[PDB]
Structures are given as C-alpha cells and as structure tokens.
Design a protein around this ligand. Structure first.
Ligand SMILES: CCC(CC)O[C@@H]1C=C(C(=O)O)C[C@H](N)[C@H]1NC(C)=O
Ligand SMILES: CCC(CC)O[C@@H]1C=C(C(=O)O)C[C@H](N)[C@H]1NC(C)=O
Ligand SMILES: CCC(CC)O[C@@H]1C=C(C(=O)O)C[C@H](N)[C@H]1NC(C)=O
Ligand SMILES: CCC(CC)O[C@@H]1C=C(C(=O)O)C[C@H](N)[C@H]1NC(C)=O
Ligand SMILES: [Ca+2]
Ligand SMILES: [Ca+2]
Ligand SMILES: [Ca+2]
Ligand SMILES: [Ca+2]
Lengths: 385, 385, 385, 385
C-alpha cells in the first residue's frame, strides 16, 4: 500500500543522533568506495543511504582526480544506513553523476543522470527497471536534487535544473507515478536560481529548500501541489543558510546578493512561519554544522533566533546536507518525522590529497531531550595514496 | 508461473544506460575476480550478471596467464547486476569454461561445459541441481552461447557447437524443460558457421545472432520454433557486424568472406526487415562500440542506415557483447524489452600485463529520449602485478 | 507475539561452549572492526553479537589511541554470533560509547549513549527507529549495561548510572515498552554503587548483577518487579566475583571494601540461595576466567564452593563478561536458558600496541556433561601497526 | 516436513562435476579462512559446505603451525557450496576440532567436539541451539565423521570413536532426534577399527564406509537399522580404497594388514554386491583421485573392475573425501542421489610452508554421459607467508 503523505510534520524540540558511517576512517584499510553527494531515503520497511561513487576505492590509484564532478564511471549505489559504502554491501542502482531516489510504498524510484554536459539524460527506474527518460532541454548540465524525492499518495516529485550555474537557468518540477513522468511544469522564476533541492512532503504539499548558486546567500524555496500549482520565494531570516554567506543581519523574501555566488546544498524545515535551518558554522567554507530554530524566520527578516544545536565544530569539515523524512507507515507515528544528513567532505580542494570523498552522519527530529556536540569525520589525512 | 515468451519486442527509439560494474577499477584494490565472457540474464524478480572466473583475483599472482581460455579452475558464478564480481557477493553456479544460463519463471537453468578439449561435457543444472548432461559429439571443444538462453512457455533453448573453429563445424539446437533435454536438432547448414549465439524470444519464436569464425564478416542467424523447425541465413546489411570486418559496402544473405576469419561474440535485434546492430567501432580490433538502426538491414544489401548511437569510443577497448531480454512478468510491460551488455576487455593480448579480464556495461531499449557517449572501462594499466 | 519471561531458569550442571569469533586473529589480515564492550542478545529467531566499534579497523592507523573510552566516532553495531565483526557483515544500530540492546519478541530495542561527558543523551530505538531519549540528570558520564536488557511480557528493562565512578553516584531503573520509557525509579541505595549491570528475567522478575567501582570487591545486585518495586544487596559469598578483589575468605551482604576500588563488568546467576559466579582467575588483572557453583553463596558468607569449570587460563587475557538468556519461544524448552559471554581484551594498557580491542567467546548452561578448558584469544601481538 | 530417507540410491553411470571453490588460489589475495576437513551437506532447500577453520586467514602470520590438528581456536563454520570460505560469507556453527552436520528437513543439526584430548565433549546443536552433549567415555580424543550425518524419517545418525589410533578403540552409533540423543550402541567389533565414517541413507537403512587407521588398507563398513541393529565388515575388493595401501591384488571380508597402518578419510557407495570406490591414485600419499566401479567388489575378493573415472591426476595433491546425498524433497527425483567431495590439501607436511589448508571439489552421481579429467587445487606455493 502507498505512502499517504497526508499527515503533518511531527512537533520537535531538537535532533537526536541517528547514524554515522565512519566511511573514510574505515576506507583507510577497508574496501570502501570513493563517493560524494550521499543522501538518505526511507521506505515503509527500511532506510538506505544512496551515494555517487567514482567507481574507485579509497587509498587506491583510481581515486586520483576525484575532485572532478562528472565522468562515465560515476554510479548511483545504495547500502543500509550507517554502513561504510563497500562493493560487498552495496546495491547497484544506476549509472549517474547526478541523482535522486525515493520509495512510494511499493517500489524504489531512482533517477540517474549521465551522458555529456551538452545533452545529459535522466534515467528513471522503478524497482530497478527503466520506466522513463528525461533529456536535457537547455543542453547545459542537466542536474537534480542529490537527495530524496518526495512522495504523496503514490505520486513522487522531483526538481531538475538545466542551464548556467552563474546566471538564470531553467527549473522544472516533475510528477511521476510508477517511475513514469505524468506531468511537469517549468517555474516562471525570473531573478531566482534553483539547484540541489531538498524536498519533503507536509500534509499533501511538497516543500523544497534549494541552492541559489547565482546571487543568493539565503535559500530559495518552492512549495507545490499534487497538481504542480506552485508558490516561490526565499527564506527571509537574517540567519543566512547558504555557504558562502555574510554575517547574520537583515534578511529578504528575494536573494541576498553579499557573498551570494556559489553555494552549498542545504535544507530547512518550515514550521508555520518558523524555520529550522541547517547550515555550516563557517561563513566562507564548508566547515562545521549547526541546527537553528528561528520561530519567525520563514517570513521575518531579523537575525534573532531561539535555539543553536551544534552538530560539527568549525574546526572540522562538513559539506552537503539534506532533508529526509520517515513516514507514519514505517514509524507507527501519527505524523511525518523530519530527519537530516550531513556529508563530511575530505581531501580536495581543501586538503593535500589526490582524491575527494565524504562520510555521512544523520539526525532525527525529536520531541524529547537532545544535546549539541561534534560528530566530525575523524580521518587523518593524507593517506598512503 | 512460467515466463510466457508469447509477446513481441517493444518498439524502441534508442538505448538508455542500465549498469556499469567498474570491476577492473575496483579490483585494483578490492577482492575482485578475474573474469571473461560475462553476460546478463533476468528472471521474473531480479537480473543477474553471470561470468566465467579464472578462479583468481585481480592484482594477484594467480591471474598470471589468464589470456588462456580453458582450464579446470574456470567456474561460472553470478552476482547482482552492476556489482563488481567478488568472492563475497558472488553465487557459485557451475564448473565451466563455456556457459549459458536463463530463468523459466520458476528456477535458474545453468549450462556449464568443462572437461578435456577432446571430450567436454555440458552440465545442466535446474535450481543448482544437476538434471542433465550433454557429451561432445565431435570431440573438438564443445562450446555454447556465453549469453542467456531463451525461454518460451516453460521451455528453454540453447545452441551448441562442436568441431573446428577454422572450418565447417557441427551445430545443434537443444530444447530443455526443467533442465532436461527433451529435443535437439542438428542444423543442416553447409558453408555456414555458428558460434557464441545471442538468442532472444519474440512472440513464441527464438532468434539467434551468432559468430562466423570461419569465413564471415557479417553475422549468421537461426530462427526456430518450440518444435525446433528452423530457418537459417546471414544478415544482409552492408553495415557489417563482426570484428574483424571490411569497411561498410555491399552486403550478402551468405557469409562475406573479406576479413571473414576469426570474429567476436555479438548480437542484433530483428525488427521486421530492419535490424539494430551492435558492433565495435574499429574494423580490426575489439575497440569502441556503437548501436546502429538499419531499417532494411535484415534483408537488404546496402550500407546505408538511419541511426548511430555511440556507446564506447574507438580509443577505448570493448569486446564481447550479447543480447538479454526483460519479460512482461518482471516489467509489467505488454512487450518483451530488448537489452544488451558489452564486455570491456583489458590486459592481454593488446596490453603489457600478465593477465586478461573484463568489466561490463549494459543498456536497455527505450521508446523515449537517449544519448550517445562513451562509458569505457576506465582502468589504468599495468597493475602492481 | 511477545516474549513472556514468565518461566524459570533451566536446571543446569555446567557450561557447554557456544561460540568463538577469533576476531583479533582474523583482523590481522581481514577487515575487522576495533571494538570493545561486546555482548550477546537473542530474539525468538536469532542471536546477535552487539559491540562498540571505534570506527576503525584492526591493523590500521585509525586504531591508534583506542584504549580511550569515549569519542564521537564510537558506534553500536551487530553481526551474527561467532562471526568476526566486519564492515561487510555488520548491521549499524546506533551512535554510542555506551549501549544496551534486547528483543521483546517483536522488534529490537537498542540504547545508545553519545554526546559530551557533562550532558550525554541515551537514544532509544525500536526496530531501528528513534522512539525516545534520556538525558543525563547528574551531568557526569551517563552510562548503561554494556549487555542485554531484560524483557518480560512486552516490557523491557534497563539500568543506568550517572555521577562519579569513585563515590556515590545515582542509579535508575527504566521500564520501556516499544522503545518508550513508561516508568523509571531512582534507587535509594546509600553506600551502594551500581554500574554495568548484567540483567536477566526469571519468572516475571528481573535480577541484575552489577559492578561496584567505588568500594566493593563483591558484586551488588538489584531485583525488581514489572512495577519497578525493588530489593537491593551484595552477593554474600566469600568467593569474591569482582576484579580486583582479595583472596577468597569471609564474605558480606554489604560491599567488601579490601581491593574494592575499580572493578570489571561481570555477572552471576541466582539459583535459590545458591549462585553461579563468573569471574577472572587473577585477583588483580583481567586474566583468566572460571565458572563457580556456590550452592549457598547468595546469602552465606563462607568461601567454600562445589564446582570450578575453567574457561580461560590465568596466562591468557580476559575482560568483561555478561549474562545473556535464551527464551522458550526460541529454544522450545519449558524454561529460560542461562548463557554468558566473555570479552577477551588485547592491547593497551597491558600489552605494547597503539590499540585496544577484544574478541569474544560464549557458553550456555546445560544439564548434561561439560568440560573445563582454555579458549583464549590466541592473537600474537604486536601487529604490523 | 521431514526428510523420509525411504527411497533407494539412484542408478548412475558416472560422476558429473558439481562444484569447485578455488579457495587457496583466491586466499592468496582474498580474506579466506585456513581450513581443513571440509564437507558438504544438503537440506530440502540448499547445499552448504561445512569446514573446520583454524581461526586464521590464508597468507597471514596466524596460519603458522596449522598442520596441528586440535586447538581451542578451531571452529565449525559453513558457507554456500562452491564459494571460498571467508569471514564475510561464512556462518558460524560451533566451536570444534572434529565435526559432523546434517539437516532433517526442519533444521540443521551440528556436532562440534572441543575440549582437552583426555576429556573432549561433543556439543549438539539443533537450529544453532544447544540440545545435547556427549562426553568422552575413553578419555582419548573423542572424534566423529568429518562429513554429513545421515537422516531417516526425522532421526539423524552418527558414528563416534574414542581411544587409541594405533590399536583397538571404542566405536558408538548415536541416534538423535531434534538434536537430542535418544539411543546409542557400542559396536562389538574385535579386531576392527572405525574412524571418520562417511554415512548415507538407503531405503531406511544407513551405510557407513570408514577409515581403519590401525591395520587395514581396505575400508571397514557398518550398516544399521532406525533401531541401531547392525552388521559389520570390510570391503572385499582387491581394489583397495585406503591410503596408504598395497597394489591391487587379492582382497578380505577382514582388514588387509600390508600398508594397513594410518589411512585417509574416504567413502564408497554400495550398489547391490557392487561398489563405487573413491580413492587416491597414489598408493602412499594423498595424491590424485579416481572413481572406480567394481560390480562385485562389496563381497568378492578379486582386483578386477569395470569403470576408472579420473578426478585428480597423481601429480596433484588430494586428501580427505566423503559422501554426501541429495534427497528427493530437494531434487524432485524418485531416488536418493549419491554425491562426493574431495578435499585438496596444500602446504604441510608435503610442501615448504608454515601452514596447511585445503580447497574442495565435488561431483554428483549421474545416469547420463560423463568424462574423466583433472580438477586440481591449482595454487602455486609458497605464499608471501
Ligand atoms: C553544475 C554546477 C553545480 C553547481 C556549481 O556543480 C555542483 C557542485 C558541487 C559542489 O559544489 O560540491 C558538486 C556537484 N556534484 C556539482 N553538480 C554537478 C552535476 O556537477
Ligand atoms: C574454440 C574456439 C573459440 C572461437 C575462436 O574460442 C573462443 C575465443 C574467445 C575470444 O575470441 O575472445 C574466447 C572464448 N572463451 C573462446 N571459447 C572457448 C570455449 O575456448
Ligand atoms: C565512567 C567510568 C567507567 C567505570 C570506571 O568507565 C568504564 C571503564 C571501562 C573498563 O574498565 O574497561 C570501559 C568502559 N567503556 C567505561 N565506560 C564508559 C562509559 O566510559
Ligand atoms: C586422532 C587420530 C586421527 C587419525 C590418525 O587424527 C586425524 C588425522 C588427520 C589426517 O590424517 O589428516 C586429520 C584429523 N583432523 C585428525 N583428527 C583429529 C580429531 O585430530
Ligand atoms: Ca549562494
Ligand atoms: Ca568472422
Ligand atoms: Ca570493585
Ligand atoms: Ca589404513
């Protein structure tokens, strides 16, 4: 039976630690994939970590040059949450240098983009079987969420971007059923930029918090129907959520252009007119991580907030982060539970190695006691090489 | 319930990337089998890659001399598609230096040939249990498909060859039910040569596209009943599909003798009087790969075609390729879906190593948008050794 | 259906060997986790070994400094009993530097404590899903059993300690149902010290044998209701069960203060007014192991006993030991079967390595013939490093 | 439902190759256990290889001295047939330096002997749970089959030996149900010696072919009821089946004393008054292997036979061999199928290594065409060490 997606997000007070894979530490000796862009997605029965391999193991010569983003060798694979991604515990999903995945209650939907920069194709699989294809419409690096798609009532939803990463691009929402595109809509969003959306379902409605790589140090959002009727905006809080970003100050409910160029994949959970913001601790680089509760931050422009929960200290590397959700049919709860993962990037460009990889940690929204701390990657670089 | 095999091949426009195992790249550090002759076969529930190991791991001294084709140590094994063939994820199937495998909807049938050159025996297993045996009848390297057998209505079908590889040999079709031979027929095919057949079911009828190692640079074919009533011929297109081969020119609906000796395992999908040809890009060696749609190529002798889709560039090594199929009972489709795999050979004889192995990529026939590219093996040779 | 916990402990005469993982021996070459604090827990269908990794493999640089007890990298994981804990056979459970786990007949409950020393949080998971949280109430290293919790009639029970490890601390019993705390009670135990409790169910009643780290060389005990109505005491036998301890002499039914400070996790099985004591052979260090039947030792103060069964010789290292139980619904027996495991610690502080790890052996209570022997760790130190 | 064991052995003409694990070849690089005494046993659903590890991996320092037979570190483990025994694919069964195992249709029974030479205990497990114990009655190396036990009608049967290995010992048959001994009988066999019995069921009757280590170069046999009513004897053929042995000549229906001392574990299948003999090719050492059909060899004393099928050449090492069986409920056949495995020993004492291990090959009885060949171990010694 299908995941309803009809209930609201659980009330929460903080975030309890959920998983830590220790991947890079283990890959010093173990046969562990070089990966980036990991993400978590759950069904009605399990939770899996999905990741983009570089088709190479850590501490091996084929990990050379793995700071490079796209190659014919990158593949989407998955393993049980909290396990080190290995060729001996990993399920092959798709050939992909950009990906999304989610479960509708019946089967896994996966989305894998591969092919040339000027004509990439998204391959959609339902239960490991190809069901559809989406071809680049702007012939400039077709790219998707790098986190879980959202499912409501047997329909799953995703965002894709095509075009420049330093200017106006083109953004589309896709509605799919059983891995087939049944509807899609291009966003009429002049002056907006959408990329690497973290999307979650909330009472029949999908909310995406994305990355403005163009000219925004605050995060853009889309909220849409099962019909793809949408509203757009930026998070107004002066607690800016992108990286890089300026210091906290007066927000905008447009893009904040200081330190607006570039960015990092992130997420936020809308709670009424309040917002839980996951962001790095550093203003410039992908270092540290904290959760911030800003009770009026969705709509109000000030820089004040109620609650900081430390997750990774500034002295340690972080990276991508994304939302995932746990549905009532898995948990037995009467509400949809918010969770998040953080990718902890090690190696290039910031460190002197021949390789780039990431490990993961994850946390779930909880209505009981929690604590801040640092759960950093913990590997000592460089490696034997 | 049994795979019907009663429906036709799906209409398609091109090929979407399905899997890439990255085996050789991973085997630089990971515990990965030295293999050749890999192939994919699906049931009603899963798809598996089958392969012939050399009973040795990559980058280990026992991989020495693995260009050699037949030994008592070669075994047929399988793992989930897209995973690197490892002793920790691989299921043992059979002792074999030549093999075939398929699923009738109930159980896996496997065929493993081992024993001496002058008296090899094919061991047939149904659900991992020995059900029959076929002894060499010409005492000269009994050999079979090195790809999936075809199943129609609880009966599975295979081709075997015995005799010289530089002259007339003897060719037999076998019909088996529950892993037992119930009927077989020797082909009355003077001047023809059949080897390494890629066979697929199409509306109750089996079509095999094979390798003429003797004197044909175009590929021979057999099409046969559930009764083993057959017709034979060669593909007429002047787009020649073997390797080695001459340049494209005037085809024959006999063997094209320039560059006819030797060959490579390949495949083709008959679509009316049209043909999808998988072939190497190079005319001499196993380099590159492309799909070609020739709308009249089954019967017409010209060298013109409609559609080239690149799969591997000439600058990269390929090798064997074969058909596999996905039945309605697995996909939910109303038609049988064509797919193919390519073996990407690395090492001897073309490169200076002590070993020979292959990785795999695969693709499925799709009626939506697709793109050409190169998805090559990607390993850097030589290895530590 | 739920584990009843309503039957009594089986009559037994001795202990039959059950498992040996050979972990450290294998981890000399194999990819094996550095672990400590392992323990066994069974469901109605299987038995699993749980352990606290250091997020590092044996014989790798990240095993450096692993004598250290608590870090953000420590995780609770599990694998089938008797298997070497590897990233390729291990299931991720929780982020934790102190842990407990048990099965109520329906799902696995796990308890993982992580976070800072001055504010650690216990994360409770039911079926891998977070169900509750317990925050440190004395802000001084919240810590739990490091063995299985006890389940009676769909309710599971655990003990936690907070406060100093060289003085009076605070001790609480928790009753949980489906991974949620429904009741808890603080023990009014002046002059007592409770830590690392080994708890087992006996006819609807839970008995814990614990570690007095403060001033007791005999072991303290709690016995409690499904209502958390309790009685407390120390084991009276002059066969002292902690390490360190004095030589056997006149017991107390309070803490025996010679050699009372520090301690080791241990266990005992109450059989009427008799007791089966698992203890080290050495009086000072964690060396050797023996089972002792003292038919009056629960209540009587003498140092005489009936039966020594050797398990590990004094010349070999042991460490932690704990109780586990096998319920009728798993075994088909009419009684609850007592079993125990021993952790065999190797490396720091006693040996010159950069690392500390442990392997495990286990034994089950049997009413047939048994034999004493030595089943030691068997690794030769140091390692390559 | 229980394995009946009520049908007869299938008619056969020869032996078709079934499995080859290539263990030692793979263990040169892969994480593979050092093992000896492997054996195969099947249920109604699968076939598993059982083996005695030395708690150490190949090509690691802990493999030193593994020619030694008995230690506290030896464990019984199992994996799917034809797979290399690894800590990542192996299930832990029992602590044991001598073992037996079989499946009654419901659960796995395992028998593991460990403990001191002068008081070893057999631990019986049903479904991985301890159900019984057998203590040494002669206090001189209690030892069992090192192959599968035989099951008839929910009862399983085994042979054990206690006493000297160069003189009269004591031999017992045990009948067990659900892993519990319900009956046992000591054989009144003066001048006979029984060890390492290969036992199989045939129409409600169990036949064991064993090893006379004392003074027999032909093999002893026991045939017994479900009641344990027995007959004893030696195989009369002048085709002697032990190793060492004299050249073929005039048999005895007592022990043939030339070259009678020592021996090797072997097997034979009784077919009326005929016999299929598995034996080494060499008369002195464990080299080579062949199957011999002697149509009158059970009862007649001559050295003539009808059919030699080569399995391993004299130039290659063999070792232990044993019977296993495949029951109708697994195969769908109307008869019980005979199969055998051969252990291929490498290293000490015959080769200069610090270690001893074995790989396995196996074969099944077939009523179709077969072929002789050599399927040897194939590892090149010595190793890195
Ligand atoms: C194409 C532009 C885009 C945003 C700058 O690049 C992303 C940056 C990345 C990053 O900033 O870490 C890694 C992503 N894998 C990459 N996406 C793709 C599909 O290449
Ligand atoms: C026996 C002749 C045949 C065609 C030349 O050789 C094949 C060539 C091969 C090849 O050209 O790559 C590899 C095949 N494994 C081999 N088949 C066998 C069974 O040995
Ligand atoms: C906090 C004090 C406590 C008792 C001395 O330390 C324990 C000692 C240990 C020991 O004596 O081996 C190891 C335990 N992992 C540790 N517990 C924690 C949670 O750190
Ligand atoms: C105890 C005598 C017996 C026969 C000589 O030794 C056997 C010889 C062996 C052999 O000849 O290879 C290996 C067996 N593992 C061993 N059995 C035990 C239990 O140690
Ligand atoms: Ca930005
Ligand atoms: Ca040719
Ligand atoms: Ca103490
Ligand atoms: Ca003998």
């Amino acid at each position: 039976v299908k995941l309803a997606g009809n209930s609201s997000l659980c009330p929460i007070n903080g975030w309890a630690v959920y998983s830590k894979d220790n991947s890079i530490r283990i890959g010093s000796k173990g046969d562990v994939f070089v990966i980036r862009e990991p993400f978590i997605s759950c069904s009605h029965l399990e939770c899996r970590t999905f990741f983009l391999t570089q088709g190479a193991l850590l501490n091996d010569k084929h990990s050379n040059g793995t700071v490079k983003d796209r190659s014919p060798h990158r593949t989407l694979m998955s393993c049980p949450v909290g396990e080190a991604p290995s060729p001996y515990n990993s399920r092959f999903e798709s050939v992909a240098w950009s990906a999304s995945a989610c479960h509708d209650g019946t089967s896994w939907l996966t989305i894998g983009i591969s092919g040339p920069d000027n004509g990439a194709v998204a391959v959609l699989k339902y239960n490991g079987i190809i069901t559809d294809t989406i071809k680049s419409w702007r012939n400039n690096i077709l790219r998707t969420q790098e986190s879980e798609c959202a499912c409501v009532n047997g329909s799953c939803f995703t965002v894709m971007t095509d075009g420049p990463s330093n200017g106006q691009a083109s953004y589309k929402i896709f509605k799919m059923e059983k891995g087939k595109v049944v509807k899609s809509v291009e966003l009429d969003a002049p002056n907006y930029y959408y990329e690497e959306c973290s999307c979650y379902p909330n009472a029949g409605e999908i909310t995406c918090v994305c990355r403005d790589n163009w000219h925004g140090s605050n995060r853009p959002w889309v909220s849409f129907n099962q019909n793809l009727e949408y509203q757009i905006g930026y998070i107004c809080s002066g607690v800016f959520g992108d990286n890089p970003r300026p210091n906290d100050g007066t927000g905008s409910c447009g893009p904040v252009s200081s330190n607006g160029a570039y960015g990092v994949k992130g997420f936020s959970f809308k709670y009424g007119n309040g917002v839980w913001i996951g962001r790095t601790k550093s203003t410039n680089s992908r270092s540290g991580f904290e959760m911030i509760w800003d009770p009026n931050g969705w709509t109000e422009t000030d820089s004040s907030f109620s609650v900081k929960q430390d997750i990774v200290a500034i002295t340690d590397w972080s990276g991508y982060s994304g939302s995932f959700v746990q549905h009532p049919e898995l948990t037995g709860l009467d509400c949809i539970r918010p969770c998040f993962w953080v990718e902890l990037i090690r190696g290039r460009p910031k460190e002197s190695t021949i390789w780039t990889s990431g490990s993961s940690i994850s946390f779930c929204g909880v209505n009981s006691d929690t604590v801040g701390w640092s759960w950093p990657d913990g590997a000592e670089l460089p490696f034997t090489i």
